[PDB]
Design an enzyme around this catalytic site. Sequence first.
Site, PDB file in Angstrom:
ATOM      1  N   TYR A 158      19.165  54.920  -0.966  1.00 47.98           N
ATOM      2  CA  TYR A 158      19.640  56.373  -1.156  1.00 47.98           C
ATOM      3  C   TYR A 158      20.025  56.894  -2.558  1.00 47.98           C
ATOM      4  O   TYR A 158      20.046  56.311  -3.312  1.00 47.98           O
ATOM      5  CB  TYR A 158      20.949  56.658  -0.212  1.00 47.98           C
ATOM      6  CG  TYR A 158      20.990  56.334   1.340  1.00 47.98           C
ATOM      7  CD1 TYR A 158      20.070  56.944   1.946  1.00 47.98           C
ATOM      8  CD2 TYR A 158      21.943  55.545   1.803  1.00 47.98           C
ATOM      9  CE1 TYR A 158      20.065  57.095   3.357  1.00 47.98           C
ATOM     10  CE2 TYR A 158      22.163  55.908   3.155  1.00 47.98           C
ATOM     11  CZ  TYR A 158      21.387  56.332   3.916  1.00 47.98           C
ATOM     12  OH  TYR A 158      21.129  56.235   5.339  1.00 47.98           O
ATOM     13  N   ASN A 197      24.685  60.486   4.705  1.00 46.63           N
ATOM     14  CA  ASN A 197      25.664  59.997   5.436  1.00 46.63           C
ATOM     15  C   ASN A 197      26.167  58.611   4.463  1.00 46.63           C
ATOM     16  O   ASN A 197      26.703  58.865   3.425  1.00 46.63           O
ATOM     17  CB  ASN A 197      25.203  59.218   6.700  1.00 46.63           C
ATOM     18  CG  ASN A 197      26.405  59.026   7.955  1.00 46.63           C
ATOM     19  OD1 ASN A 197      26.836  60.201   8.036  1.00 46.63           O
ATOM     20  ND2 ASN A 197      26.384  58.097   8.365  1.00 46.63           N
ATOM     21  N   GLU A 248      28.385  56.433   4.430  1.00 43.29           N
ATOM     22  CA  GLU A 248      29.767  56.283   3.960  1.00 43.29           C
ATOM     23  C   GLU A 248      30.231  56.704   2.611  1.00 43.29           C
ATOM     24  O   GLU A 248      31.049  56.030   1.894  1.00 43.29           O
ATOM     25  CB  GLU A 248      30.180  54.609   4.292  1.00 43.29           C
ATOM     26  CG  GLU A 248      30.250  54.401   5.553  1.00 43.29           C
ATOM     27  CD  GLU A 248      28.805  54.112   6.194  1.00 43.29           C
ATOM     28  OE1 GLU A 248      27.928  53.360   5.984  1.00 43.29           O
ATOM     29  OE2 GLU A 248      28.656  54.743   7.313  1.00 43.29           O
ATOM     30  N   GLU A 257      18.880  59.677   9.827  1.00 38.27           N
ATOM     31  CA  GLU A 257      19.197  59.828  11.558  1.00 38.27           C
ATOM     32  C   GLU A 257      19.414  61.230  11.841  1.00 38.27           C
ATOM     33  O   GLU A 257      20.450  61.475  12.396  1.00 38.27           O
ATOM     34  CB  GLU A 257      20.450  59.051  11.388  1.00 38.27           C
ATOM     35  CG  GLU A 257      20.516  57.646  10.962  1.00 38.27           C
ATOM     36  CD  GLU A 257      21.662  56.740  11.627  1.00 38.27           C
ATOM     37  OE1 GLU A 257      22.820  57.282  11.869  1.00 38.27           O
ATOM     38  OE2 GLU A 257      21.494  55.383  11.997  1.00 38.27           O
ATOM     39  N   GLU A 315      16.802  50.799   9.707  1.00 37.65           N
ATOM     40  CA  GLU A 315      18.077  50.276   9.301  1.00 37.65           C
ATOM     41  C   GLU A 315      18.506  49.471  10.426  1.00 37.65           C
ATOM     42  O   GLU A 315      18.789  49.923  11.527  1.00 37.65           O
ATOM     43  CB  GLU A 315      19.232  51.591   9.179  1.00 37.65           C
ATOM     44  CG  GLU A 315      19.221  52.517   8.084  1.00 37.65           C
ATOM     45  CD  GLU A 315      20.165  53.482   7.932  1.00 37.65           C
ATOM     46  OE1 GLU A 315      21.297  53.249   8.718  1.00 37.65           O
ATOM     47  OE2 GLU A 315      20.016  54.454   7.628  1.00 37.65           O
ATOM     48  N   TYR A 337      30.630  45.200   2.288  1.00 43.34           N
ATOM     49  CA  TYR A 337      29.951  45.352   3.549  1.00 43.34           C
ATOM     50  C   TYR A 337      29.717  43.987   4.233  1.00 43.34           C
ATOM     51  O   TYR A 337      28.998  43.832   5.573  1.00 43.34           O
ATOM     52  CB  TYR A 337      28.463  45.924   3.470  1.00 43.34           C
ATOM     53  CG  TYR A 337      27.835  46.838   4.586  1.00 43.34           C
ATOM     54  CD1 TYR A 337      28.425  48.113   4.721  1.00 43.34           C
ATOM     55  CD2 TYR A 337      26.964  46.258   5.408  1.00 43.34           C
ATOM     56  CE1 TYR A 337      27.959  48.740   5.793  1.00 43.34           C
ATOM     57  CE2 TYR A 337      26.452  47.254   6.405  1.00 43.34           C
ATOM     58  CZ  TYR A 337      27.106  48.370   6.529  1.00 43.34           C
ATOM     59  OH  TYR A 337      26.629  49.166   7.711  1.00 43.34           O
TER      60      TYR A 337
END
EC number: 3.2.1.23
Length: 971
Positions: free
Chosen positions: A56, A100, A102, A160, A259, A325
């Site tokens: 990203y 997105n 997070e 998404e 993903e 993660y």
Amino acid sequence: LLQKYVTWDEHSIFVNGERLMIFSGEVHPYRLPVASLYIDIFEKVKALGFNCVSFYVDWALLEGNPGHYSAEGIFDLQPFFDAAKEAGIYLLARPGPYINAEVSGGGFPGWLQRVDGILRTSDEAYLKATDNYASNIAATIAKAQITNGGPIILYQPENEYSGACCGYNGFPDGSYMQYIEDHARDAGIVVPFISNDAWAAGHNAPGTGAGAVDIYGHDSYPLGFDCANPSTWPSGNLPTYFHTSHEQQSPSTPYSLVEFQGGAFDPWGGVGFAKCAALLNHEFERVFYKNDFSFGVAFLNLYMIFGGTNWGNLGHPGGYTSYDYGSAISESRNITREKYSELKLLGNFAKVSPGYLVANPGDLSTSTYTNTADLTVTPLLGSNSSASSFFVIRHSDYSSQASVEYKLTVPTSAGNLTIPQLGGSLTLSGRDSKIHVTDYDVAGTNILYSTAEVFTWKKFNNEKVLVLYGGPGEHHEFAVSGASSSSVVEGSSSGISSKKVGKALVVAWDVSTARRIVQVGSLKVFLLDRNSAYNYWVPQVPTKGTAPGYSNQETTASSIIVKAGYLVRSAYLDGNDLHIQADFNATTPIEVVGAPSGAKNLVINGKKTQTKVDKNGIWSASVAYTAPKVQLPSLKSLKWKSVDTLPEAKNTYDDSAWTSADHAYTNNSAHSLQTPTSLFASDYGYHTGALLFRGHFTANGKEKTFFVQTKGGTAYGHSIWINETYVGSWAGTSINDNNNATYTLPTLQSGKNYVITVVIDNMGLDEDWTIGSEDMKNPRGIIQYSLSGQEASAISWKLTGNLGGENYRDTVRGPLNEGGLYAERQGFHQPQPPTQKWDSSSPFTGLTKPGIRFYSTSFDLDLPSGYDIPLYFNFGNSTSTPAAYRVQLYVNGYQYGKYVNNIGPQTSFPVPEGILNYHGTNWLALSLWAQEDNGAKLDSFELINTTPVLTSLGEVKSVNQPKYQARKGAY
Ligand SMILES: *[C@@H]1O[C@H](CO)[C@@H](O[C@@H]2O[C@H](CO)[C@@H](O[C@@H]3O[C@H](CO[C@H]4O[C@H](CO[C@H]5O[C@H](CO)[C@@H](O)[C@H](O)[C@@H]5O[C@H]5O[C@H](CO)[C@@H](O)[C@H](O)[C@@H]5O)[C@@H](O)[C@H](O[C@H]5O[C@H](CO)[C@@H](O)[C@H](O)[C@@H]5O[C@H]5O[C@H](CO)[C@@H](O)[C@H](O)[C@@H]5O)[C@@H]4O)[C@@H](O)[C@H](O[C@@H]4O[C@H](CO)[C@@H](O)[C@H](O)[C@@H]4O)[C@@H]3O)[C@H](O)[C@H]2NC(C)=O)[C@H](O)[C@H]1NC(C)=O
Ligand SMILES: *[C@@H]1O[C@H](CO)[C@@H](O[C@@H]2O[C@H](CO)[C@@H](O[C@@H]3O[C@H](CO[C@H]4O[C@H](CO[C@H]5O[C@H](CO)[C@@H](O)[C@H](O)[C@@H]5O)[C@@H](O)[C@H](O[C@H]5O[C@H](CO)[C@@H](O)[C@H](O)[C@@H]5O)[C@@H]4O)[C@@H](O)[C@H](O[C@H]4O[C@H](CO)[C@@H](O)[C@H](O)[C@@H]4O)[C@@H]3O)[C@H](O)[C@H]2NC(C)=O)[C@H](O)[C@H]1NC(C)=O
Ligand SMILES: *[C@@H]1O[C@H](CO)[C@@H](O[C@@H]2O[C@H](CO)[C@@H](O[C@@H]3O[C@H](CO[C@H]4O[C@H](CO)[C@@H](O)[C@H](O[C@H]5O[C@H](CO)[C@@H](O)[C@H](O)[C@@H]5O)[C@@H]4O)[C@@H](O)[C@H](O)[C@@H]3O)[C@H](O)[C@H]2NC(C)=O)[C@H](O)[C@H]1NC(C)=O
Ligand SMILES: *[C@@H]1O[C@H](CO)[C@@H](O[C@@H]2O[C@H](CO)[C@@H](O[C@@H]3O[C@H](CO)[C@@H](O)[C@H](O)[C@@H]3O)[C@H](O)[C@H]2NC(C)=O)[C@H](O)[C@H]1NC(C)=O
Ligand SMILES: *[C@@H]1O[C@H](CO)[C@@H](O[C@@H]2O[C@H](CO)[C@@H](O)[C@H](O)[C@H]2NC(C)=O)[C@H](O)[C@H]1NC(C)=O
Ligand SMILES: *[C@@H]1O[C@H](CO)[C@@H](O)[C@H](O)[C@H]1NC(C)=O
Ligand SMILES: *[C@@H]1O[C@H](CO)[C@@H](O)[C@H](O)[C@H]1NC(C)=O
Ligand code: NA
Ligand code: NA
Ligand code: NA
């Protein structure tokens, strides 16, 4: 369409006209702001057998000041692209604009809170707001495309784009997605567009008109994001419909999981990433990832493969500093987790199995392929009778921990067989899944079948090598078409049977910790137990240069097999010297299978190594490891200097330079004002870190209480003072993003002027996952207020966030790094602060009352060169009832931690070499905000290291660390 480098058909993607099973790992460049370390991540991903990485780009970090795109220094993407190319890894670019991930705002810069249009829609104001970023990032990505000799092969528009709510009914908007796609193409993007639907809904699939992507993709996180119960696998969570939905939604393109769960995020007050690693462990991987192969997945990306860190306030309130993660590669970049080794087995299977891509996925069955309904098998059948087939087997109840014995009844070129043919039964242990193969090709030699799984295989001149493995206590069998007999050329022949059955030689064996090598004609079959296989690596070996090259049939064919330890990064032949680059965390036996004919010597990490050669032509050696001394400072013993960072709580404070919160309107289209003027920080350009508000008024003597509603995001907190008198604090909790409170006040004198100072912690801006929710527009600041006995307009407000707001002061560290605390506004968090007149007090002494102090100290490091050593800053928390205090951790100016003693769960903060200087001076700084009447202090605060890894990794270059400089207009 626009190019021929990346194409596709129903079975797979083609790169350079050659089919390639694309197995990728998610990596975010902005979560590891150390250019020198990108190569480490890529080499660790390549070592899994992977050939791609998905990333990203965070808009909030590149256009913090509207109108000025900036991606230089630590934000420069070129070093990331170069490392991918060097390591031989392709890239899937996912620039958003919305990601997105997070991260704060889900990628949206805070000024989006002033945009008069619904986010992620065709509303004119929103689309225009994205143009500058979109054109700039697409142009950068365009230059790195494979069509221009770069590693980028795919591009994802949006993220998404799968659902809406709350009054927005334009979803799905074909013209919206088409707009993003057209803009990227106009910027030079020619590679295929791939989507990532939140679930298999078919949004933007080929044939849907405007907005349709080239390859339809979707995501899946079967076990969820709550890691509280690591051993619990809820009933029905294993998806079984992906192939069915794929054939209905996009049969013309390769099945793609853009993903797929590789871990999970964890919220403030969460359970810790160790539990997430335990939930999404090696068992989860073998069961769920092989389940994905049962659907014929041709493009599989694991989110995340390496998570990194949410340094400098880049994360959202739904998470804390760490973004470990629970992934295969930890936050400190280590690969000790068993899930990493297990994943490597599957990655390497895929890399050498072209037959898998052209096999046709079928329906799962509990009766057709085994003699027991307790097991489920999904077939991937070859195009014809002689084509390879694959059978993915698992427990019918995917969560089963039971051990089940069975017999496999599968179709082959020799007809339907019942395996084992020589007697005995196969075993599938608890939470395990295997891919059995039939008519599997090994360079011209047909492996009629093998119950044990394939790790890898190679043809070395005239010798063929096949590596098989089984879990503990398993009995296996394989057959080689046209073979006459066999010989055990290594290990005991105990438990190994060999018999010619029909037109194939059948060999039965039992898994053992001791390797056995069975010679069948020109084929050497290595028989291993899973844990031994964990230590094997398959590095590519280029003829010229040191770079491995991208993964393709040719580079795969010239790869070699190396048994080693912690890691094998690469290999190359230079003259008669075979060079192997590897990392070690213990004494490591070395074995090289398939050394090139011209290779005479073995050089490991630049050191000539003594080697011996055995009957099977295997080179053997050993690398010694001796834990080096790692001298670290005792933080409590360092010389600390401190300064009050809440000078606002003094009657002498002058806030004339502060921004006047005097807008009788808000630009927040999702939230109307409830106060005379806007007290939403983003309306004034303050989107990150601590926010301060000062309300001036002339008392009338009738005041008794001050009601206020503040909002700072999940887990935030606030503290209030009236002139120099403490009023109170909201220490925050893991479930509150705002708070309503009515505070009593001391009696005030009519006619005298007072000021109410409200300090609010900002935990980041929220995401906007559901279109129309406008959650990203949740404000930060004061939502409501009422001073009893006075009109709201009686209070005139001033406010401040980071100095300069959108015209932020630290161009090197980014728009989000520093907050609005006095010490931050002054730049005291940077190297060499002006501590001459500061007090000599440490955070171990702390505060004896509510307030905020800033601390500084320095220490030199001179760690063992040639070692990759993870360093962590650990805070103690042994007390039962936690004290309420907040800490911001600054290392050489970079904020690498937000610690909230009363909320948690993070106590250990890793900081990478590059940010920390391992052979120089380091400047440590901390803000300590006591939110309780008793004050606050650190009881335990240390810098510790974990296992020093003997490494071949090049010397890490320290990133730019701007030293403190008196700032103009500071206050
Ligand atoms: C340097 O770097 C390396 C990495 O390169 C680091 O090594 C890694 O360290 C990890 C820990 O940080 C470790 O993960 C934990 O493993 C625990 C052990 O269980 C596993 O291993 C069992 C076999 O032991 C052998 O191998 C391991 C390493 O794999 C080794 O530590 C042992 O000493 C031993 O080695 C010897 O044998 C091998 C060959 O076999 C040789 O190569 C060596 O030279 C040695 O001679 C294995 O049985 C077990 O698998 C069973 O259990 C798991 C579940 O735990 C099942 O999924 C699996 O199906 C299997 O169960 C079946 O079989 C058993 C046995 O018959 C049967 O009873 C069952 O019913 C069933 O039929 C594992 O593979 C593991 O306990 C631990 O798990 C944790 O605790 C619980 C477990 O209860 C778990 O739920 C939690 O989630 C948690 O994770 C970890 O998984 C890595 O395996 C290891 N990797 C490598 C490559 O070594 C090293 O630490 C680092 N050094 C330093 C200083 O930092
Ligand atoms: C260092 O170690 C310490 C331990 O020594 C550790 O502290 C623990 O940290 C955890 C995690 O943060 C705490 O657990 C969480 O606590 C949350 C806060 O609970 C309080 O506040 C709640 C919110 O109240 C406000 O908002 C509501 C709603 O708007 C409003 O009604 C209220 O008036 C108020 O404004 C409140 O709901 C909650 O009330 C419960 O408990 C009290 C006390 O017993 C009881 O009287 C009530 O009737 C009610 O039962 C309480 O006042 C809490 O929200 C959170 O719960 C959510 O998450 C869990 C999962 O974790 C879910 O199971 C649950 O359903 C919720 O979704 C959770 O319980 C824990 O309290 C701390 N322990 C101690 C002793 O303080 C630190 O974190 C460690 N630090 C580090 C760095 O690691
Ligand atoms: C602190 O106190 C505040 C109130 O002082 C709490 O917020 C209120 O919470 C209640 C209970 O959940 C909400 O009540 C619901 O209201 C629904 C109707 O909502 C509309 O009408 C409200 C009345 O004027 C209005 O406030 C609300 O505004 C929201 O939407 C607007 C349009 O997008 C936007 O401009 C505003 O900023 C705001 O987002 C709507 O116009 C009704 O359908 C439900 O049945 C229920 O009654 C209130 O709406 C909340 N008030 C606001 C302004 O959000 C808050 O939760 C307390 N904090 C804590 C931690 O407890
Ligand atoms: C590799 O990186 C990971 C992630 O940074 C490191 O994991 C962390 O390891 C520590 C030490 O083992 C764990 O803390 C310990 O937890 C146990 C269980 O509660 C407790 O008894 C100990 O007192 C200690 O607190 C921590 O949970 C874990 N964190 C995560 C996110 O997994 C690991 O140490 C690194 N390994 C190496 C060799 O570098
Ligand atoms: C509360 O604090 C305010 C500061 O905001 C005090 O007012 C200032 O006082 C200083 C010192 O006398 C003057 O130089 C400033 O001109 C004042 N500014 C304002 C806005 O009046 C105020 O006196 C304090 N109140 C009390 C009673 O202590
Ligand atoms: C062989 O097995 C297949 C699939 O399991 C089955 O359909 C068939 O009836 C069996 N016999 C034949 C025709 O080979
Ligand atoms: C914010 O609102 C003011 C007043 O309505 C307006 O003049 C200004 O253009 C708005 N800013 C944006 C970004 O729309
Ligand atoms: Na070869
Ligand atoms: Na505790
Ligand atoms: Na904790």
